[PDB]
Amino acid sequence: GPGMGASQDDYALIHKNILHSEDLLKYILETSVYPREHEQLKGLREVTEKHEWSAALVAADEGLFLSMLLKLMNAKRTIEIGVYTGYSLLTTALALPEDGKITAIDVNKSYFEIGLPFIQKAGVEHKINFIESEALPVLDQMLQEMKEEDLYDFAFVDADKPNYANYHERLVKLVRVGGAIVYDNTLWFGTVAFPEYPGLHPEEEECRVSFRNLNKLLAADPRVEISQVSIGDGLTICRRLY
Amino acid sequence: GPGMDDYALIHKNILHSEDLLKYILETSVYPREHEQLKGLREVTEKHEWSAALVAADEGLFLSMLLKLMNAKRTIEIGVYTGYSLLTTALALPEDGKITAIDVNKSYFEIGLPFIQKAGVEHKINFIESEALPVLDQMLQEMKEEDLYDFAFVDADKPNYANYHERLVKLVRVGGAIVYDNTLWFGTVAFPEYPGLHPEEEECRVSFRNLNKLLAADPRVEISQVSIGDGLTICRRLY
Ligand SMILES: Nc1ncnc2c1ncn2[C@@H]1O[C@H](CSCC[C@H](N)C(=O)O)[C@@H](O)[C@H]1O
Ligand SMILES: Nc1ncnc2c1ncn2[C@@H]1O[C@H](CSCC[C@H](N)C(=O)O)[C@@H](O)[C@H]1O
Ligand SMILES: O=Cc1ccc(O)c(O)c1
Ligand SMILES: [Mg+2]
Ligand SMILES: [Mg+2]
């Protein structure tokens, strides 16, 4: 619609970090992440760092953390909501077993096609079923077709932040009991800690309010147990109880 | 000796402000913290070594990790008043079993009433000893059927690398080894750091050596996580 520009340059928060020290973040990346980062993940990240929406790219240390969760819980079928150039998707496909399957959802397939050659060189494209659509209609259609034996083990939500609570209502029924739902960016550059934060783009302010509401909802939701983790831009792990 | 304290690292917060950390604790931790964990934490904050108490948001994450991997047999090295131990016992199933090792049982007795009131004392086998002899004796007695699903290391920091050599044999393949404090209050990010107590400086040097060792170790895959004082999760590959 008409109005204000909403590109990455129009945002105010992209350079703000949740860690106190930029040196500490760089130490973590150079000591414990890059030596453990798949060669195709490196290439995918380096191209994405030059893309016009580079700030949306998931943090590399968070990527290795998501991989660790997937392997430790022996995930086999996963769903990803928000693919962009595919760094978390390629991370997920490399973590799953040979016969693992991923449902990847994003409104923009041209983003996915930037990383697709790296995913192909890694040899894990066969695991991925990409769906070019808005996530919410796809999730609602799944609620009409998916049977108990096909529930997902793991869900990574990293798409349009104001819709997280809406995705949550579907994902607590699409993920198996004891499965995991991970919401990205639940600390939103640290702005969630304040009731009001000046100097934000309208979309950044909307995400601050939605995340402040989401973090309260998730902490009070009896259907899941949660753990908020201050890695990357913050994430919240949910484990379905019933 | 009496003819010879005063430390620099007391407050755990690697986030950009006190406000952000307090927001996480009040919004996402305290409403999910067990009441006996709350009682244990509040009395431990009055203890003279309260700086050693595990970060509460880090404890909730340990609980999440134990359930997601369905751990049943765990080992903890470094108990103190027992916050992470009680966190573990509350997360395991009713038949879960924990081997808890610490050199000082008087610390463990501070949290034992809370563990008992929580009804999970039956899951814990506490061993008052230095951990390295106990682990070495485990390497001669334990069989493949008795391997641990999960290990939490939170004891004397310069011994972490030595613990690692034992635990990559005592934790099952695909099991987890978790090390607390691998970011050591942020000090590991610098080759030199001024004004540290000699013991705090020795831990900084050891963690810088440990972090490089773990990242080069082909026996495990790692993930270092900037939560609390930093933790490194290790998954045994073979
Ligand atoms: N309503 C919607 N439904 C599905 N995808 C959406 C959406 N709104 C935005 N998106 C997509 O969500 C993505 C968020 S960026 C995601 C980052 C990516 N997971 C990584 O690892 O780096 C964008 O690619 C955007 O196209
Ligand atoms: N060599 C050793 N073997 C076993 N435990 C040791 C040790 N050296 C120190 N410790 C113990 O390790 C503990 C570190 S403090 C650990 C904090 C605790 N895990 C929590 O949840 O808060 C101390 O209680 C100390 O007594
Ligand atoms: O001994 C000091 C200390 C400080 C912080 C810790 O997390 C810990 O385990 C020990
Ligand atoms: Mg994100
Ligand atoms: Mg510690």
Task: State phi, psi for B223 to the nearest 5 degrees.
Answer: -150, 115
* Separation of alpha carbons B214 and B221, rounded Å: 8
Annotated binding site of B: 54, 80, 84, 102, 130-131, 154, 156, 180-181
Gap sites in chain B (C to N > 2.5 Å), preceding residue numbers:
4
By C-alpha distance, the chain A residue nearest B25 is A228
CATH number for the domain running over A22-240: 3.40.50.150
Judged by a CB distance cut-off of 8 A, whether residue B25 touches chain A is: no
Which of B20, B32, B183 is opposite residue A24, by nearest beta carbon?
Answer: B183
The two tokens of residue B137 are 């004796």
Burial class (CB in 10 A: 0-12, 13-18, 19+), B159: middle
- B183 neighbourhood in chain A, CB within 8 Å: 24, 28
> How many secondary structure helices (H) and strands (E) does chain A include?
8, 7
Amino acid at the residue B202: E
The two tokens of residue A41 are 């993940």
By C-alpha distance, the chain B residue nearest A190 is B20
DSSP-assigned letter for residue B232: E
Pick the closest to residue A60 from A100, A107, A28, A105 (CA basis): A28
> Do A204 and A16 form a contact (C-beta atoms < 8 A)?
no
Q: How far is CA B198 from CA B6, B53, B161, B193, in A?
A: 11, 21, 19, 11
Supply the Cα-derived Rg of chain A in whole angstroms: 17
Pick the closest to residue B63 from B27, B37, B81 (CA basis): B37
Resolution (Å) of this entry: 2.2
**CB neighbours of residue B137 within 10 Å:** 11
Amino acid at the residue B162: N
Fold (topology level) of B18-236: Rossmann fold (3.40.50)
Task: State phi, psi for A203 to the nearest 5 degrees.
Answer: -70, -40
With tokens 């990383």, the residue in question is A115
